[PDB]
């Protein structure tokens, strides 16, 4: 794997920590007092890293990320398991809140309690047909499961001296903390890990000493009973014998440098990396019913000592039939175990044989965490660097391009269903097959069910755009998709404000009535006849109308622009394409034009103010005439004769009758991807943008030359919007509260 990109800073050592989110946010401790600071990274925007003070007191030893993103847990070696949430929703402005404390050091992984949804990826046995059978739901249970059947949030944390801390998080917002000893014989737990056993979440807390002591697994249930947390422990089959203390090579591997359950939520498989000074040996173990007892599932030849172990995070079915077709189709991602060595190398492991799948002979990596699709790494280098290495779906094997297509399509569809993120998949998409991926996405979106297509009718556009940012043959299409997303948004927030009084007789919503009349019945070339054949009882209180002007002026300026671009003046494919030529977006715009006419007949203020050349021309009527002509030409399928000479004749006059405005376009930037290289790395700096490759896009409020007000910015969209909702107390709250979390693409906000 090549470096995606690697960025250092400008410039004793303590253990580091990193945690890659469900979305793409990395949180690494980065011990350079800025030794105790948590760094947050956007991973599609390095060079802007937020340094949370973290207010801890000893080394931040365990970091961990909520299964939903949106929450970060950091425990020190003093005991403050502190929960970091997202201050008014913004990915670069974290805030400290409810946590807990026990003065011993939380040395074992802080775990985040398991919601019921586990996952399943039937990998290539069914990487052909549909979405339900590709990505299935396994029946794992929650921890405490609820009062009423939906999991309770919380965090287990085991400390040296073998305490446990459950600390449930009540929906009320206050913690219910508890503490109880693992085993009555208190003992040293130096390296330890937590994972969750499917049956009712009887979560198992493995805990070893340092050397030649058993690894001593345990069992801890959670027991909300009596309005106070309760935890009950029972020992489990202990496992001595890392299998290196019996080969009569006695002390060649004293210490245990790592023990990590092969996957959280996948207990009954543990990885044990013994080591020494310049030596290491890793072994997996499996708890088989024989009485339960552990026995080696795989062991590795002597190795240079391991510095960091990173586990796969993508759910993959280990069934024999599935691994068979994975070996055939070479869909390697899930079957990976990233071991990082002191010499400088990085090896991937088979996860069931612990052979070597790939190497990166290339200062070692002291903290390493895989991505959520097994396509990226994050190596906090010892000197202070940070690399994002690409792990190819097939470990460098050049197998045919259709197969790479099927691999990446399967992963992207997984990311569509789970909604996690797809920046990693974007790291690998070559510029050659972006068009083909988009075509296969079109297919696999049409084919599915006509029910799930609603779930994905907003993520499909985002993935289409993020793909089309590659492949310089199709950069023209990203602007139009991010405009179609905005058009859909406006249509769904203006067809939802109607609120009539009448419901005349039948089931016909005012938006449904809008659409049915506009499309089916009155394809009249002239407005004020569409206004006639409609109920004029769309009355919003005259305050929200006035607040709606900054948006309706968009739909106005966009109709004007789209109709202006018909003569195709530009030599290249312009930035209004594909909205011409057979779009239903023409129908949507016509609906919005009719409703704007009806609105403005009530309050003239909330109309699109066009700067006209002729004084009394009724500009809206002319634009509606042009739209109707274009939509009549583009409704029925087949005719490339839409630009009938009359229509282009009318359109080429439009600069003479109005002033073609200048719009933002909302890719608003070209992200780090589509810039990296095929192979070459990209040296970066923290706080200094790569030197070379003001519109408030969600309120359409012009910030001046300089902004003078703070503003967030979508990480993937490029959008920029004002942070404090600068409109008056009277402001449409169907918009500012729609984007207050994730923006229309679906990406987090970041402060400027």
């Amino acid at each position: 794997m090549d470096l995606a990109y690697v960025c250092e800073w400008e410039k004793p050592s303590v253990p580091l920590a990193c945690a890659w989110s469900c979305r793409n946010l990395i949180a690494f401790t980065m011990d350079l007092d800025l030794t105790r600071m948590i760094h947050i990274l956007d991973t599609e925007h390095p060079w802007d890293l937020h340094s949370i003070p973290s207010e801890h007191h000893e080394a931040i030893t365990c970091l961990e990320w909520d299964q939903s993103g949106s929450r970060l847990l950091s425990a020190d070696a003093d005991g403050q398991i502190k929960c970091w949430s997202m201050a008014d929703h913004l990915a670069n402005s974290w805030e400290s809140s409810v946590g807990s404390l026990v003065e011993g050091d939380p040395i074992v992984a802080l775990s985040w309690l398991h919601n019921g949804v586990k996952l399943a990826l039937h990998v290539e046995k069914s990487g052909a047909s549909s979405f339900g059978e590709k990505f299935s739901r396994v029946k794992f249970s929650p921890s405490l499961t609820l009062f009423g059947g939906k999991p309770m949030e919380g965090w287990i944390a085991v400390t040296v001296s073998g305490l446990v801390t459950v600390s449930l998080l009540k929906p009320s917002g206050q913690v219910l903390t508890s503490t109880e000893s693992l085993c009555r014989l208190r003992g040293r737990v130096a390296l330890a890990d937590i994972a969750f056993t499917g049956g009712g979440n009887i979560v198992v807390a493995t805990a070893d000493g340092s050397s030649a002591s058993p690894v001593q697994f345990y069992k801890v249930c959670v027991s909300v009973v009596s309005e106070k947390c309760r935890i009950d422990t029972e020992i489990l089959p202990s496992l001595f014998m890392r299998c290196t203390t019996d080969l009569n090579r006695k002390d060649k591997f004293p210490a245990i440098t790592h023990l990590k359950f092969l996957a959280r939520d996948m207990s009954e498989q543990v990885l044990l990396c013994a080591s020494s000074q310049t030596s290491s040996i890793v072994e997996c173990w499996s708890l088989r019913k024989e009485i339960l007892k552990w026995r080696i599932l795989s062991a590795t030849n002597d190795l240079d000592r391991v510095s960091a172990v990173a586990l796969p995070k993508l759910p993959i079915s280990l069934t024999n039939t599935d691994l068979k077709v994975a070996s055939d189709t070479q869909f390697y991602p899930g079957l990976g175990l990233a071991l990082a060595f002191h010499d400088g190398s990085v090896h991937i492991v088979h996860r069931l044989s612990l052979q070597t799948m790939a190497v990166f002979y290339s200062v070692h990596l002291k903290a390493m965490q895989l991505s959520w699709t097994s396509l990226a790494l994050v190596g906090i280098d010892s000197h202070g660097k940070l690399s994002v290495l690409r792990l190819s779906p097939s470990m460098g094997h050049p197998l045919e391009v259709g197969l790479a297509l099927r691999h990446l399509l399967f992963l992207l569809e997984y990311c569509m269903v789970t909604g996690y993120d797809w920046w990693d998949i974007l790291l690998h998409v070559q510029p050659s097959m972006v068009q083909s991926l988009v075509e296969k996405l079109h297919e696999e979106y049409t084919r599915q069910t006509a029910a799930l297509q609603q779930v994905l009718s907003t993520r499909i556009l985002a993935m289409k755009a993020s793909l089309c940012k590659l492949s310089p043959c199709t950069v023209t299409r990203v602007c139009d998709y991010h405009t179609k997303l905005f058009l859909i948004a406006i249509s769904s927030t203006l067809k939802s404000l109607l609120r009539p009084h009448f419901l005349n007789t039948p089931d016909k919503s005012p938006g449904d009535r809008l659409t049915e009349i506009c499309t089916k019945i009155t394809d009249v070339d002239i407005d004020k006849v569409m206004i006639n054949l409609k109920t004029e009882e769309f009355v919003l209180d005259m305050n929200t109308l006035q607040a709606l002007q900054q948006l309706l002026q968009w739909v106005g300026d966009f109709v004007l622009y789209l109709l202006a671009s018909l003569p195709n003046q530009g030599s290249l494919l312009r930035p209004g394409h594909s909205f011409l030529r057979d779009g239903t977006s023409l129908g949507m715009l016509r609906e919005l034009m009719v409703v704007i006419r009806i609105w403005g007949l009530l309050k003239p203020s909330c109309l699109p103010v066009y700067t006209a050349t002729s004084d009394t021309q009724d500009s809206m009527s002319l634009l509606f005439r042009l739209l109707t002509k274009l939509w009549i030409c583009c409704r029925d399928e087949g005719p490339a004769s839409e630009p009938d000479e009359a229509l282009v004749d009318e359109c080429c006059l439009l600069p003479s009758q109005l002033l073609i405005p200048s719009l933002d376009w909302l890719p608003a930037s070209d992200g780090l991807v589509s810039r990296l290289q095929p192979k070459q790395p990209l040296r970066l700096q923290f706080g200094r943008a790569p030197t070379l490759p003001k519109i408030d896009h969600l309120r359409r409020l012009h910030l001046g030359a300089c902004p003078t007000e703070e503003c967030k910015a979508c990480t993937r969209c490029g959008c920029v919007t004002m942070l404090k909702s600068p409109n008056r107390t009277t402001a449409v709250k169907q918009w500012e509260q729609r984007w207050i979390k994730n923006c229309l693409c679906g990406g987090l906000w970041w402060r400027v």
Binding site: S70, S172, P506
Partner: protein
Amino acid sequence: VADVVFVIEGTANLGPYFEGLRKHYLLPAIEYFNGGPYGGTQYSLVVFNTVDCAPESYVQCHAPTSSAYEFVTWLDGIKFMGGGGESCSLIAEGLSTALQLFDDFKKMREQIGQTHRVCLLICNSPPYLLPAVESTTYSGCTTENLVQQIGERGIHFSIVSPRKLPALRLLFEKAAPVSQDPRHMVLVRGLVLPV
């Protein structure tokens, strides 16, 4: 003497109107169950977001609280976060969790009182058309079937909505054993509110 459960939308366009809809209807609801804000009335609350969430816990169930003031504290600070650019919030999974609550309340009661269960669906959006894929007790059960099973169990439910939406009238009529602002659609079952 009964236990209620309210299924408010989490994030949809209800957020604006909810501040007024809470008084004129939701305050008389708590009143008809107490005079003027472990045994007896177990209030419950359930919020459900839209599909626009990279998994963020589709439904935030609260708890049963017997204190009418604890319920008004829940009902306040139901932060109406970002609903997507799409209509059609998922009342399906909300109704699924609601029935689970009722069921548990039933297995909790188990005693002499078989009290009338009231569940109110405050949503400005239409149904989502996709089955309850989040719940572990009820999966694949599309909202329609959920409404049938919530009607047969003998619990009467009232959909208040700040906007007159037909996709919800067909919902409410489809199960069976006054508006301060004329735009609202406020149709109640078993609860008496001042006309």
